[PDB]
Amino acid sequence: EYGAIYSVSGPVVIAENMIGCAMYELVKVGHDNLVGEVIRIDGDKATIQVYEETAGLTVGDPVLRTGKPLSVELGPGLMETIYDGIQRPLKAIKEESQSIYIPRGIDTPALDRTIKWQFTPGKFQVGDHISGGDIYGSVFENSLISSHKILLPPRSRGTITWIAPAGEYTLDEKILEVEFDGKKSDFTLYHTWPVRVPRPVTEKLSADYPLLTGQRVLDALFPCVQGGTTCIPGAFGCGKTVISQSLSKYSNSDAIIYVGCGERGNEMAEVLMEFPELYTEMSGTKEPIMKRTTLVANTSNMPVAAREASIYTGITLAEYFRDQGKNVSMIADSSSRWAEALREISGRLGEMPADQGFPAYLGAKLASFYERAGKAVALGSPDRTGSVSIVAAVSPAGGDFSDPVTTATLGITQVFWGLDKKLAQRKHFPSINTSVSYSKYTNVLNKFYDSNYPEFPVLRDRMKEILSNAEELEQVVQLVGKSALSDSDKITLDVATLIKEDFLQQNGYSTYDAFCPIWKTFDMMRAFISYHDEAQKAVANGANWSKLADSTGDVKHAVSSSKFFEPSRGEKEVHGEFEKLLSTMQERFAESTD
Amino acid sequence: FAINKKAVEQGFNVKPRLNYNTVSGVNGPLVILEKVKFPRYNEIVNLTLPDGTVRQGQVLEIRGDRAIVQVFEGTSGIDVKKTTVEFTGESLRIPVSEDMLGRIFDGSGRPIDNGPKVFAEDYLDINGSPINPYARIYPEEMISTGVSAIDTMNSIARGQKIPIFSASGLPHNEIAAQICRQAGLVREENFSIVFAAMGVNLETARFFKQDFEENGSLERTSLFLNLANDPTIERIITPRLALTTAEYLAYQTERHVLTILTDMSSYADALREVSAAREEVPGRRGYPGYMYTDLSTIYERAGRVEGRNGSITQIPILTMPNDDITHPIPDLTGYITEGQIFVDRQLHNKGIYPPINVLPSLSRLMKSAIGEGMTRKDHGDVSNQLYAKYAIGKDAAAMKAVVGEEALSIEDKLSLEFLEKFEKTFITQGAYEDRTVFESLDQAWSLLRIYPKEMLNRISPKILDEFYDR
Amino acid sequence: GNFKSKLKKAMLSQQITKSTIANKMRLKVLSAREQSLDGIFEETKEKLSGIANNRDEYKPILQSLIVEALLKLLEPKAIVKALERDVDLIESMKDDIMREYGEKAQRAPLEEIVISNDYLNKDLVSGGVVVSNASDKIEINNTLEERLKLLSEEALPAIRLELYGPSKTRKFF
Amino acid sequence: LKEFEQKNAGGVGELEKKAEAGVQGELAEIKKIAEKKKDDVVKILIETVIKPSAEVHIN
């Protein structure tokens, strides 16, 4: 088919003579073959969304079909590579065009056609029968990851005729030829897949293994588990970057997909060179970390349409990797910008909006997007298992914090991390709100705790109750000051303040200001609770609390400085210091208890 | 050297332009044509009224042989029989040359200094293209300003988009005048300054002109003046022209450029004006639900490129029309621009120039900008302790106002004393008085010494031991 | 205080004077360059006037002008307004253009042409043509002087480059 | 104060030469280069003006 550009209005184009097309099929438009998508069918006239700028267009311009939906390439070379919203390597484009700008209509292969990859035959030989999604050999990619498995794309089976031998092969070379009902299928190293269709899987499964982050409070109060979602609302300058950096640089995830949509960009301009030199000894003394994570960016100046395609691309890649069984965790900059783009494009279309001007289908979009995550058993003969987690942020600025995007997100999320703002003016980080936040995974994580830390769960309840009492008492402090406080009330007030100051701060950058292991956090829990309970008991048995505190003195400095230990000093020296601190504090209380 | 010949060889190429007389409908700032023979999208046209006056406009949307033109300079006196509209086949451009320095242009980018036309070296599309993030240098090279507050708590690096949040009847103009008067780095090349004046009054313009003449920096600067007595539609163009000029200078001459964008409030107002007639979906408070993208386009046009020494730093001036921060404009700006400078009102009410309240302000890039070799290492933790003490003084005074000194602890009195000394000696400075960063650190240490060694908790032991004494 | 105020005033006076002088100098330089360009334009106008006076040159050039105008219009009919003293060559080449219009295109040749019974002021233009739609609503100006005016700005960057050679300060273009 | 004023009153006179001395150089240089390139510019301009072109629109 061929058609003419009948009418243009901003990012919306209307063509003609388009009868054999189907909605969501890719199309090439303009003399520069810009990419677009089909939305509305009006007999022969069709409305195209364009992922590129305009003002070069004119009436009566050619258009072309593609006979395929929107898809991305899956295979090798994906890692260490930064792509645009539509999977184009920015560095390759820059260094080929020899320009600092981003020329429109520039087209390049999604994957390098120059690297010869080292393939070796796998669990299959010549003349076999295979099914969809089955690993049939691997290929070495990186020092960090040295076995990039290769498997048939889903919806493909039959009896294979020939398998290629080991050696170096460019991804474009055929290696396996199969016969479903005839030799009508030969498979190279890589393939593609339509984004909108979630990839199949053997079966979903429960997710209980905890997901570590190193951040003290998160692992303490509102843990996140491998497989599942978590929203992080907040305004500008709310430390969102801090959490992003922490989770990226520190985690047990087997792969990370950082996604930037409608972002400052300069965050890329920092992280890009920060990322590789931020060596982390994962899988042993393996310094490189960029092999642990790719990155797709989409700055604000980019055409609005890509700000949606980026998210689908990221989730697709995460699912693809999870199909190999390696755990994954994709991260989003702000779905708020995605909602903005959806609203703007729908309005330009002209359909009546829902509340706040947003398209009604936003809720379904978000629900499906989050549903794509989880933990399951990967399809394939080798019978491996994978899992994908997800986290994202929000940008509430409409005058509240219950805007439809936030409400829709909360409706499907299990972990909620509310963020304050005054804490930022107080330079207190992480600036989360322990007052308004919750999680729904502790119930099952209790099994893992009993496996390793059976005492751990029973402490956090009392831990949070301390804070609860703190904000229950502060009211009278504002009202009539501290006039009728008993010794116990002051004990609770002061220990809560100490907790806020010490245990609720990851400030700075150092061994103890960058990461905290689970055991160190557990020991700090033990120390804090022991101190509180012993002080309360000593005063209850009879002790002038003001005098008792003035006499105990340096116990506070000792417990506080306990955090300043170096995490990962062998899990014994730190343990010994915690033990001796406990002994000293208990003996000091005993002497001063009466 | 001869590559310029290769680029401009196309210049000796002449193509005619059609004269249409097909006015088919007009409603306010919109005109409609017909059978226009393959019009190009977002190109420019010229109108000749029967009186014999020339206006200008652009096409905004196109369907089959029907284009909607937008006229920047009014729409009155429009007929259907004596209207001469001729296309241009291009988007609007601008005569660009290094020669314009020391020239004054109207809001429409035309000389208004009684000077002749400038023989531009080239022309550029007013709107630009996004820059590949892969070729962006993260900011460094902290910038001195001669102002204690900014240089001590919100240091600025070469290449940064940071707004100023002020309200009506505040010396923001004078603050900017002092800043440009006290530009430079502490660690040189005199800055090249671009001023974009949109929707202002005569007094502000004359003040700025006199300030530039006094400092003498006029000779290395040029201006775009758009006042309140000029068409609102064209008002949105001036920032684009200024930004394009800054791009040309910085990234084809390797110059350090400073841009002062004024009255983003008026620009937003003009955006809302044009959107309302267009009948777009109002995102909030009437402002269209996509103006965020336009603000991004304006602001994300700054930074440092890999191979370009020249740098461009944007300091837009923003006025909240409620004395409030929750207004959509500052909210979106904060979402966009790293760093932010607030302006106090009580200090102005208390006659404390320059009236600034540090606590709301924040700089998200001062972290790497400061450090060793540029300042003594303490600077950062000193600033943090200053923040802590300042906030404690504020809330302690607030609570005292309810209970009074009788329920106050001694540390509360220390906080109040530190607050008063800080706000009456440290922040304040005369119109022509500047301080080195090291002098500011000396003042901060002197004020901090009011407290003992113990109360200082945001400071590592070694820093206290090294700088607690004189 | 009075001394400090007067010292600031003296600084202001000196700065005003020097800025004014610099402005005068730059204005004079730019005005001189403008004068040179204007002289060049005067010479160009003289050349156009001289060339218009030879029928031999005028005929093929006029034919090409009209052909270009028609190929812009893409209409089966057209009207031509020009100077009375030029109607001779137009009548000469009427059929030639009649067939050439289609020849360059791939449709049928033109149908008809009307020479408007009204003509431009001689002082207004030395020579050239003005072509108009059969409905006299869409028209194209190919007058030679108008051609000069149009070219005098689009090609200006190359003109200045030639006149002043390399920029000496552009390191990326 | 009067003595200080006497300095800013006689300041006139030098600025004249200070500026004009500088200006003559560029005035003369521009004059000479323009004189050199007169004929070349005229030739190219005439060629461009008389240039015959014929192009149907892309569509």
UniProtKB/Swiss-Prot annotation, chain B:
Keywords: ATP-binding, Hydrogen ion transport, Ion transport, Isopeptide bond, Membrane, Nucleotide-binding, Phosphoprotein, Transport, Ubl conjugation, Vacuole. The modification Phosphoserine is found at S129. Its main location: membrane. There is a cross-link at K6 (Glycyl lysine isopeptide (Lys-Gly) (interchain with G-Cter in ubiquitin)). The keyword Ubl conjugation applies. It is a peripheral membrane protein. It holds the Pfam family ATP-synt_ab_N. ATP binds at R364. One of its GO terms (molecular function) is ATP binding. One of its GO terms (biological process) is ATP metabolic process. CDD domains: ATP-synt_V_A-type_beta_C, ATP-synt_V_A-type_beta_N, V_A-ATPase_B. The keyword Cell inner membrane does not apply. It comes from the Eukaryota. GO terms for cellular component: cytoplasm; cytoplasmic stress granule; fungal-type vacuole membrane; Golgi membrane; membrane raft; proton-transporting V-type ATPase complex; vacuolar proton-transporting V-type ATPase complex; vacuolar proton-transporting V-type ATPase, V1 domain. It is found in: Vacuole membrane. NCBIfam families: PRK04196.1, V-ATPase_V1_B. PANTHER family: V-TYPE PROTON ATPASE SUBUNIT B (PTHR43389:SF4). Non-catalytic subunit of the V1 complex of vacuolar(H+)-ATPase (V-ATPase), a multisubunit enzyme composed of a peripheral complex (V1) that hydrolyzes ATP and a membrane integral complex (V0) that translocates protons. V-ATPase is responsible for acidifying and maintaining the pH of intracellular compartments. Present with 131000 molecules/cell in log phase SD medium. HAMAP family: ATP_synth_B_arch (MF_00310). Belongs to the ATPase alpha/beta chains family. This is V-type proton ATPase subunit B. It comes from Saccharomyces cerevisiae (strain ATCC 204508 / S288c) (Baker's yeast).
From Swiss-Prot, chain C:
It is a peripheral membrane protein. GO terms for molecular function: proton-transporting ATPase activity, rotational mechanism. The keyword ATP-binding does not apply. GO terms for biological process: endosomal lumen acidification; Golgi lumen acidification; proton transmembrane transport; vacuolar acidification. One of its GO terms (cellular component) is membrane raft. Its main location: membrane. The keyword S-adenosyl-L-methionine does not apply. Changing S19A: Reduces ATPase activity by 88%. Prevents assembly of V1 subunits at the membrane. Keywords: Acetylation, Coiled coil, Hydrogen ion transport, Ion transport, Membrane, Transport, Vacuole. Changing T143A: Increases ATPase activity 2.1-fold by increasing Vmax for ATP hydrolysis 2-fold. Reduces ATPase activity by 90% and produces structurally aberrant V-ATPase complexes. It is found in: Vacuole membrane. Present with 16134 molecules/cell in log phase SD medium. Subunit of the V1 complex of vacuolar(H+)-ATPase (V-ATPase), a multisubunit enzyme composed of a peripheral complex (V1) that hydrolyzes ATP and a membrane integral complex (V0) that translocates protons. V-ATPase is responsible for acidifying and maintaining the pH of intracellular compartments. Belongs to the V-ATPase E subunit family. Homodimer. V-ATPase is a heteromultimeric enzyme composed of a peripheral catalytic V1 complex (components A to H) attached to an integral membrane V0 proton pore complex (components: a, c, c', c'', d, e, f and VOA1). Interacts with VMA5; the interaction is direct. Interacts with VMA10; the interaction is direct. Interacts with RAV1 and RAV2 components of the RAVE complex, which are essential for the stability and assembly of V-ATPase. This is V-type proton ATPase subunit E. It comes from Saccharomyces cerevisiae (strain ATCC 204508 / S288c) (Baker's yeast). The gene is VMA4. The chain holds residues 60 to 232 of 233 of the full protein.
